[PDB]
Every structure is written in structure tokens, then in C-alpha cells.
Amino acid sequence: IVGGYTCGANTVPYQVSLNSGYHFCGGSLINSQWVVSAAHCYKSGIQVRLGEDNINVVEGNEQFISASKSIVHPSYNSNTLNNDIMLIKLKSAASLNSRVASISLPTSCASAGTQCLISGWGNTKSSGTSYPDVLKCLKAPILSDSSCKSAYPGQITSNMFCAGYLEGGKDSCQGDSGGPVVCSGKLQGIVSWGSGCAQKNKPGVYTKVCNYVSWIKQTIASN
Ligand SMILES: NC1=NCc2ccccc21
Ligand SMILES: [Ca+2]
């Protein structure tokens, strides 16, 4: 997250870190045994880390649970990033509490202008690299489809939305992928892609979760 703020420990209780020896992506806990992330975060050997603030220090609220299975969306295209969503099942259910909690799926899609909370452990620099170790947060509005498509001609599908600031300075970045965009208490987006980080006229692009609620619910019900 570039241009954000330190969230505070366990203030984003649905935020998970995906670890394969190291943090490589975020995710969102949607019930005691399932996480939503980005399809481009897929790999084998995932351990889901819940209750994290500093990802390099055991602080006492963590739960570390290996994945039993991952399900990448059937229509994910890794060249276009269309349908950049996957589900990860935990081998055992997380213990839910104030600091480890699920986030609700949306009832309807959120509108341009709606404020959202974006979070992650990704790079905090637009030029060069610095990783923060504690969770970073950014409040950002959803941008209109028109301005998203004008920023990224030929790239924005019906399964994507932009959020952030056309002036730059505030955005998600490398290492935030797969993490949440929460608006009005519902998971509306997944950190997906952008051209650089926090650059003018290149806002972040997010998977449009409301298009996937039926797939998520049906997949969970049978897996
Ligand atoms: N918003 C983003 N710009 C670059 C990037 C990489 C990975 C995830 C999100 C972004
Ligand atoms: Ca920790």
C-alpha cells in the first residue's frame, strides 16, 4: 500500500497473509474454513496466516492453518487477468473471535463514489521497494467505469473496477494482491493489478466480487 496508514493490530480481522515460506499475497476470510484471494496468487504449498499484524513476529493472536485445496475460477485468464479470483480451503476451521473474523459477501455491487478500505503488506513505495511488515490501510473511492476505461483503454472487463485517485500518490502495490477491498462492511473487491503503483492516471484495478457470489457460494457448498 502506497500512501496509506498503519491500520493498527487486528483492526482488519478478515485480512489474511498467504505464506509459502514468506508472505506472497493477501486474502479475505469469508467463513471459518474459506479464504477469497486473487487467481494470480495461485501456487501449491499455501499456509494461511490469520490474526496477523507484524508478519515477521509472533505477537500472540495468529492462527497458522495449511490449505487443503485451492480452486481457481474456471474462466481465469492469466494474460488479461479477467476473473482474477480463487478460493482457498483451510485444513481445519479457524477459531473466530474479535481479531479473526469473516467478512460478508456483498448483496449488491457497490457504486462509483463509494468509499472502501483496502489493506495489505505490499510495497509502500512507488519508486523502489520497501515492505512494511505491519498491516497498512488505505481509504479510497471506487471510480466510475468510464474513468477506469479511459485510464486503461482496452483492458477493463465487466469483472473489474478501479479504485483510488487519478492524481496518484495513494494505491495498492506489489504484495497486496489477493487482499480485500471492503465497502460498507462487505467484500466488494480483490486487489488485482495496476500499471506501477500510485502513478497519475493509473489507479488500482480490482476484481469485482459481486459478480462471483453465486460461484463462491456454490463452490463452498460442494467442496
Ligand atoms: N494497484 C496496483 N498497482 C500495481 C499492483 C500490483 C499488484 C497488485 C496491485 C497493484
Ligand atoms: Ca505475526
The domain locations on the chain are 5-7+103-211, 15-102+212-222
DSSP type of residue 106: P
Whether residue 173 has its Cβ less than 6 Å from ligand 1: yes
**How many degrees, rounded to 5, is the angle at CA 104 between CA 27 and CA 9?**
55
Looking at domain 15-102+212-222, its CATH superfamily turns out to be Trypsin-like serine proteases (2.40.10.10)
Q: How far apart are CA 133 and CA 140, in angstroms?
A: 21
Q: How far apart are CA 206 and CA 173, in angstroms?
A: 12
| Residue 137 and residue 4 in contact, taking contact as beta carbons nearer than 8 Å | yes
44 is known as an active-site residue: no
What stretches of the chain adopt beta strand conformation (E)? Answer: 5-6, 15-19, 23-31, 34-37, 47-50, 63-72, 86-90, 115-120, 136-141, 160-163, 180-183, 186-193, 204-208
CA 29 to chain centre: 10
Q: How far apart are CA 69 and CA 158, in angstroms?
A: 28
Residue of 52, 71, 54, 72 lying closest to 62 (CA atoms): 52
Residues in the chain: 223
Q: How far apart are CA 179 and CA 84, in angstroms?
A: 12
Q: How far apart are CA 153 and CA 138, in angstroms?
A: 25
Instruction: Check whether 145 is labelled as a binding-site residue.
Output: no
| Residue 193 and residue 141 in contact, taking contact as beta carbons nearer than 8 Å | no
| Residue 140 and residue 165 in contact, taking contact as beta carbons nearer than 8 Å | yes
Residue of 143, 152, 223, 138 lying closest to 194 (CA atoms): 152
Could you tell me the distance, in angstroms and rounded to a whole number, from the CA of residue 38 to the centre of ligand 1?
12
Q: How far apart are CA 8 and CA 19, in angstroms?
A: 21
Which ligand has the shortest distance to the CA of 162? 1
DSSP type of residue 206: E
Q: How far apart are CA 203 and CA 198, in angstroms?
A: 7
Name the burial class of residue 154, with classes exposed (0-12), middle (13-18) and buried (19+) by CB atoms within 10 angstroms of its CB: exposed
Q: How far apart are CA 110 and CA 25, in angstroms?
A: 24
**Helical (H) or strand (E) element with 195:** none
Q: How far apart are CA 80 and CA 216, in angstroms?
A: 21
Backbone angles phi and psi of 82, in degrees to 5? -70, 135
Of these residues, 17, 28, 40, 102, which one is catalytic? 40
133 is known as an active-site residue: no
177 is known as an active-site residue: yes
Which grid coordinates belong to 216?
A: 463462491
Which ligand has the shortest distance to the CA of 19? 2
Could you tell me the distance, in angstroms and rounded to a whole number, from the CA of residue 123 to the centre of ligand 1?
9
Backbone angles phi and psi of 146, in degrees to 5? -60, -50
Q: How far apart are CA 132 and CA 138, in angstroms?
A: 14
DSSP, collapsed to helix, strand or coil, labels residue 77 as: strand
The structure's method of determination equals X-ray
| Residue 85 and residue 38 in contact, taking contact as beta carbons nearer than 8 Å | yes
Could you tell me the distance, in angstroms and rounded to a whole number, from the CA of residue 176 to the centre of ligand 2?
17
Q: Do domains 5-7+103-211 and 15-102+212-222 have the same CATH topology?
A: yes
Q: How far apart are CA 67 and CA 93, in angstroms?
A: 11
| Closest protein CA for atom 3 of ligand 1 | 194
Which grid coordinates belong to 24?
A: 506472497
Tell me which fold the domain 5-7+103-211 belongs to.
Answer: Thrombin, subunit H (2.40.10)
